[model samples]
Target chain A: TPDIQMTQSPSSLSASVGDRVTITCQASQDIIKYLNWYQQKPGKAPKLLIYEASNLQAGVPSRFSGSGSGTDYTFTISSLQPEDIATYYCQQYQSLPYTFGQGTKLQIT
Target chain B: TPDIQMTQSPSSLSASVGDRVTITCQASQDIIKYLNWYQQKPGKAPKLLIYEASNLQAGVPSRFSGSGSGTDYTFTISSLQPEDIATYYCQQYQSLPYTFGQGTKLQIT
Candidate 1:
C-alpha cells in the first residue's frame, strides 16, 4: 500500500484582521486534483472550504482560495476576518485511505 | 446543493478493554452512496479508517470494521483497546459540500 504524507507548515499562526494569511501543504507524492481543504472550529464539525486543489466549495467566501498542484498546494485567506479563526486541514483523496495534514491553527491577534 | 445530513448516535461513549463498541450513522435521505469513516485523536489530524462503506483502510487494525448501506451505517471496534479511545466521525461523499457527523467521543472506562 502506498502512503502519501501531507506536511503542513507553521502548526500555529497568529494574525490580525484584514491581514493576508496563507497555509501550505506539501504532499510526499503527486495527488493531481485530489486535494481539499477544511475548516474546523471548536466543538464543531469541519466544513469544506476548497476541493480539487483550487475550487472553492459552494457558499464559501471568495476571500478563501486554494492553488498549487502536483505535490504542493496552498490555501489562502485574503483579508482574513475574525470569523476565519479556526484550525485548517488539507486532505488528499487521490489515493486509497485519504490522509489529512496535521492542521494549521489560526488565530486573530 | 444537496444537504445530506449525518446523524451519529450517542454523542459520547465509555467502554472498557476487550469490549465490542459500535457506532451508528443515519443519513437524512437515502443516498445509496459512498461513505467514509475517520478517527481523530486529540491534538492530531483525523485518519481514514474505512472508505466506500465497508472497506477498511490499509494498515488500519483488523479490529475496526464498517457495514450497512443506503441511509444507515455502522462502525465497530471488536475488542477495543485503550488506544481506541478517540473521536470518530462519519462522512458522506455522494453529495457536494461533503458533511461529517458531529463526532462520537470514545473513552476508556
Candidate 2:
C-alpha cells in the first residue's frame, strides 16, 4: 500500500462562507520535509494539520493552511467555520509507516 | 502552548487476552529526536504506529513497538489481539508545528 493521492470532492463535500476547499497530495517519493497534516473529528484522536511544507502546528488555528513542495501538496481552509468540519488527512514523513492520503471529508453546507 | 501528556485509561478502553496496553508520552520539550506513532480506526484515516524512535514503518507489523529517548515516551501493544483495536497517537517532530499526543482508545473485550 504505497500510494498517496487525494483530489477532493465526493469523498464527502459541502461548503459555505468564503468557500475555498482544497486538499491534494500525490507523493510516492521526495517527501522532503517528510510531509504531514491531520484533523480527525469523530471520536477524536487526530489533529496536527500541516508540517514541513508550510508549518502550523502548536494549537493549529489560522484558518488551517498548507502548501506543497515535492510531490504536489495542498490543504486549504481559508474561512470555512462551523468547527471547520472534519476529516482531512495527508501524511508522508518521507519514510517509515508514515503514509496517508485518502481522506477529505468536510461538510458544512 | 506545548503540551503532550498521555496516561491512557477511559478516554475509551476495553481489552482482553494477551492484554498489554500502554501509551505514554510526556513531552513539553526536548523533542530532539522527534517522536511519532499513529493508528486510527473507524472510517480509516491513520496508520503509522511508530517512527524515529523504534523505526518500523514499512508495512508495519510485529505487534507494534516503540521506545522513549527524550521527554519520556512509550507505546507498546504486544498482543492485544482483536484487530488490535484502534485510536492511539503520539507525535512530536523536534520542532515546526509537529506536536500531537492526546489519543488513547482501544476496545475489544
Candidate 3:
C-alpha cells in the first residue's frame, strides 16, 4: 500500500500581477528528491515544470523554481505572469503508485 | 526540448457499466524506460493507478492493470464502474522532460 500522503497548501490562491507566488507541498514521509511539479490548464494536459525536487524542466521559464528536501517541498513563481494562471500539482515518485497533492489553483487577481 | 511523444487512442470513449475498457499509448520511439498511468477526474488531482508498466499501484483496484514494453503500452479496466468516469493519461518517465499522453476521456453511456 502506497501510504505517502502529499498535501498542498491554500487549495486556491489569488495573486496580483508581478507578485511572487509560492506553493507548499508536504509529504507524509521523506521522499528525498523524487518530487516533481506540474502545471495544468483547462482543457489541456499537465506540463512538467520541476523534477527531482529542484531541477527545472528544459524549455520551462526560469521564474519557476522548486526547492525543499525530505518531507517538505515548495514550488515558486519568482514573478507571476498572466500566463501562470492555472492549477499546480506536486507529485512524489519515490514510492510505488506515486502520489499527487490535491492541487493548488492559481488565479490572477 | 521534449523529445518523447505519447499518443493515446480514441480521444473519447463511451461505455456501459460492467463493460471492459482499454486505452493504448504509443511512444514516439523506443523508450525502454518506465511508463506510468494516471486517472484524473474533473476538479481533482490526477491519481496514480499503475507504474513501471504492468505494476498496479497500491490501493488501485485489481481490475486496473497495465502492460507493455519498449514504445507501446496499454491500460485496461476489466469492468468499468460509474466512479471510473474520468480522463486517463499515460506518462513516460524514461527520459528527461517526461511527457504525458494527450489524454483519453472515458464516459458512461
Q: What stretches of model 3 exceed 4 Å from their correct place? A: none
Of the two candidates 2 and 3, the one with more favorable TM-score, higher being better, is 3
Model 3, range B15-107, lDDT digits (tens) per residue? 999999999999998888488889999999998888789878667889998989999898899999999999999998888889999999999
List model 2 lDDT by residue over B1-86, tens digit each. 54544334336678796888777777766775678777877787777767777787766678878888878878888878887787
The per-prediction i-RMS, to one decimal, reads 0.9, 9.8, 0.9
The candidate with the higher DockQ, 1 or 2, is 1
Separate DockQ for every predicted complex: 0.85, 0.28, 0.86
Lowest lDDT 10-residue stretch of candidate 2 chain B: B1-10
Residue-level lDDT tens digits of model 2 in A15-104:
887787877777766666567777888876666767676878666788878887877877788778888888887777565556677787
The true-versus-predicted C-alpha distance at residue B60 of model 2, in Å, is: 5.6
Of 1 and 3, which scores higher on DockQ? 3
Q: Pick the candidate with the highest DockQ.
A: 3
DockQ of 3: 0.86
Per-model chain A TM: 0.97, 0.31, 0.97
Candidate 1, residue B85: Cα displacement in angstroms equals 1.0
Worst 10 residues of 2 chain A by lDDT: A1-10
